[PDB]
Every structure is written in C-alpha cells, then in structure tokens.
Design an enzyme around this catalytic site. Structure first.
Site, mmCIF file in Angstrom:
data_model
loop_
_atom_site.group_PDB
_atom_site.id
_atom_site.type_symbol
_atom_site.label_atom_id
_atom_site.label_comp_id
_atom_site.label_asym_id
_atom_site.label_seq_id
_atom_site.Cartn_x
_atom_site.Cartn_y
_atom_site.Cartn_z
ATOM 1 N N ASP A 175 0.827 -1.211 0.000
ATOM 2 C CA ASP A 175 0.000 0.000 0.000
ATOM 3 C C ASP A 175 0.861 1.261 0.000
ATOM 4 O OD1 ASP A 175 -1.905 1.890 0.207
ATOM 5 O OD2 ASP A 175 -2.892 1.075 1.995
ATOM 6 N N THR A 176 1.033 1.853 -1.180
ATOM 7 C CA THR A 176 1.789 3.088 -1.313
ATOM 8 C C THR A 176 1.122 4.271 -0.627
ATOM 9 O OG1 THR A 176 0.738 3.630 -3.447
ATOM 10 C CG2 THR A 176 2.740 2.300 -3.487
ATOM 11 N N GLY A 177 -0.168 4.179 -0.325
ATOM 12 C CA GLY A 177 -0.856 5.242 0.369
ATOM 13 C C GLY A 177 -0.764 5.204 1.885
HETATM 14 C C1 LIG Z 1 -4.873 9.035 4.319
HETATM 15 C C2 LIG Z 1 -4.375 8.233 3.119
HETATM 16 C C3 LIG Z 1 -5.040 6.840 3.075
HETATM 17 C C4 LIG Z 1 -6.523 6.856 3.403
HETATM 18 C C5 LIG Z 1 -7.293 7.759 2.446
HETATM 19 C C6 LIG Z 1 -4.295 5.942 4.102
HETATM 20 N N1 LIG Z 1 -4.846 4.551 4.123
HETATM 21 C C7 LIG Z 1 -4.257 3.541 3.182
HETATM 22 C C8 LIG Z 1 -5.206 3.293 1.992
HETATM 23 O O1 LIG Z 1 -4.543 2.603 0.993
HETATM 24 C C9 LIG Z 1 -6.391 2.478 2.511
HETATM 25 C C10 LIG Z 1 -5.983 1.069 2.901
HETATM 26 C C11 LIG Z 1 -7.283 0.291 3.243
HETATM 27 C C12 LIG Z 1 -7.856 -0.706 2.247
HETATM 28 C C13 LIG Z 1 -9.126 -1.470 2.582
HETATM 29 C C14 LIG Z 1 -9.830 -1.243 3.909
HETATM 30 C C15 LIG Z 1 -9.250 -0.245 4.900
HETATM 31 C C16 LIG Z 1 -7.981 0.521 4.575
HETATM 32 N N2 LIG Z 1 -7.348 2.347 1.411
HETATM 33 C C17 LIG Z 1 -8.592 3.081 1.344
HETATM 34 O O2 LIG Z 1 -8.992 3.718 2.269
HETATM 35 O O3 LIG Z 1 -9.288 2.969 0.100
HETATM 36 C C18 LIG Z 1 -10.724 3.377 0.027
HETATM 37 C C19 LIG Z 1 -10.882 3.999 -1.045
HETATM 38 O O4 LIG Z 1 -10.924 2.854 -2.044
HETATM 39 C C20 LIG Z 1 -11.612 1.726 -1.302
HETATM 40 O O5 LIG Z 1 -10.741 0.405 -1.428
HETATM 41 C C21 LIG Z 1 -10.222 0.157 -0.060
HETATM 42 C C22 LIG Z 1 -11.035 0.807 0.752
HETATM 43 C C23 LIG Z 1 -11.639 2.050 -0.107
HETATM 44 S S1 LIG Z 1 -5.217 3.959 5.700
HETATM 45 O O6 LIG Z 1 -5.533 2.532 5.660
HETATM 46 O O7 LIG Z 1 -6.380 4.636 6.281
HETATM 47 C C24 LIG Z 1 -3.712 4.292 6.663
HETATM 48 C C25 LIG Z 1 -2.555 3.288 6.623
HETATM 49 C C26 LIG Z 1 -1.286 3.582 7.411
HETATM 50 C C27 LIG Z 1 -1.178 4.863 8.219
HETATM 51 O O8 LIG Z 1 0.003 5.122 8.949
HETATM 52 C C28 LIG Z 1 0.184 6.477 9.290
HETATM 53 C C29 LIG Z 1 -2.337 5.860 8.242
HETATM 54 C C30 LIG Z 1 -3.615 5.578 7.458
#
Ligand SMILES: CCC(CC)CN(C[C@@H](O)[C@H](Cc1ccccc1)NC(=O)O[C@H]1CO[C@H]2OCC[C@H]21)S(=O)(=O)c1ccc(OC)cc1
Lengths: 99, 99
Positions: B25-27
């Site tokens: 997860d690059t995000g």
């Molecule tokens: C703030 C940037 C972004 C959230 C906006 C960060 N996220 C990583 C994402 O990749 C998450 C990772 C994630 C994936 C799946 C379930 C929960 C979290 N994906 C996500 O939220 O995607 C959503 C949008 O597309 C949908 O597909 C997945 C969920 C939907 S996270 O999970 O909330 C997160 C991870 C590590 C962290 O350390 C500081 C802080 C926050």
C-alpha cells in the site's frame, strides 16, 4: 517514471480544469477526492476505509489527467482526509508495483 | 516481481512466526496489521483514514518477510480490516511505483 517510496507518492492531477495534488494509493480500490464542484450527474454512494464508512458523491466517466497521463473513470467526492488516486485509475495509466 | 493493479496487490508475508496476506500500500505511511498478540513493549497510537481514526499498538523493530524480502521496522497492530504493508517497509524491499 520510477517512483520510490521514502516520501509520499504525491503527484499533480488535473480534473474539471483544475490542478490539484493527489496521492497514488495502491491500497485504494477507488479514487476519492476532497470536497469540490464537478460538472455532471452524480449518485450518492458509501465507501469504507480504515476508520469506518463515509457518504460520497459518485461521478462516472470523469476525465482526469495524472502526470500527463489521461484517465477516464469513476471519481468519488467526499470527506476523505487526502485526495487519493485508486486502482481504478492507476490501471488506466499503466501503473505497476515493482521490487 | 512486477505486480499489476487489476486486483488488490495482496502478497504473503511472514511476521511473528505467522504467514498472512497483506496489501502493498503506497498510500499508507506506516504498516498496520490485523489484531494479533505480539510479545514485547508497545506504545499506543491513533491513525486516521477514510471513516476516521482507529487506536493501534505500535511495535518497533519487528521483522517481516515480504515475498522472501526481509524488512524490519515499526508495525502497528489494531482493528484494521486488512493487513497493510506501508512505505516504511516497502522502501526496505526496494518497492517502486512505475508508469
Ligand atoms: C490518508 C491516506 C489513506 C486513506 C485515504 C491511508 N490509508 C491507506 C489506503 O490505501 C487504505 C488502505 C485500506 C484498504 C481497505 C480497507 C481499509 C484501509 N485504502 C482506502 O482507504 O481505500 C478506500 C478507497 O478505495 C476503497 O478500497 C479500499 C477501501 C476504499 S489507511 O488505511 O487509512 C492508513 C494506513 C497507514 C497509516 O500510517 C500512518 C495511516 C492511514
């Protein structure tokens, strides 16, 4: 380009004729942008993240340019903490993970 | 290897003697793992994303093997719906975004 991950993979995007910063997010299925005005019709949807579910406006078939690479697809707009580019668009620009 | 983004970039990892599936997860700034009983000292932390924040336990200097690539760093454990490998470890295995 080849992007390393010691910093957030932030890039400039163009959507609706406006430039913005967005995060390339391989952990997101969908593209979610902060509150903004977009032209066209939209339907209310729900998406879940790490902290729960939120209400978003779903815009279909939206033109969006990412580092000069054009994509046309679904853009969700709602109270996301940051503009994120998800896999639905990352695939269209030919993005892959490599190690 | 090269991983396309048609589907979620799930890979097998090894941590604390357990094999798990986790998202590249690059995000994600940091690595977040589903609830598990790790030994050692920790400090509380809160991380935010779509939907708000969750409380997690921060363990430092945790060894994780990602597709046979070894990495050691900070690992957060809490009620996440998915195992998330974040940039702090992705950089250690030489992972890049490419398009
Ligand atoms: C703030 C940037 C972004 C959230 C906006 C960060 N996220 C990583 C994402 O990749 C998450 C990772 C994630 C994936 C799946 C379930 C929960 C979290 N994906 C996500 O939220 O995607 C959503 C949008 O597309 C949908 O597909 C997945 C969920 C939907 S996270 O999970 O909330 C997160 C991870 C590590 C962290 O350390 C500081 C802080 C926050």
């Amino acid at each position: 380009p080849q992007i390393t991950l010691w910093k957030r993979p932030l890039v400039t995007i163009k959507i609706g004729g406006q430039l913005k910063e967005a995060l390339l997010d391989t952990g997101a299925d969908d593209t979610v942008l902060e509150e903004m005005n977009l032209p066209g019709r939209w339907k209310p949807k729900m998406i879940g993240g790490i902290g729960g579910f939120i209400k978003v406006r779903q815009y279909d078939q939206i033109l969006i340019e990412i580092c000069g690479h054009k994509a046309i697809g679904t853009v969700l707009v709602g109270p996301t903490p940051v503009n994120i580019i998800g896999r639905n668009l990352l695939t269209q620009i030919g993005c892959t993970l490599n190690f």
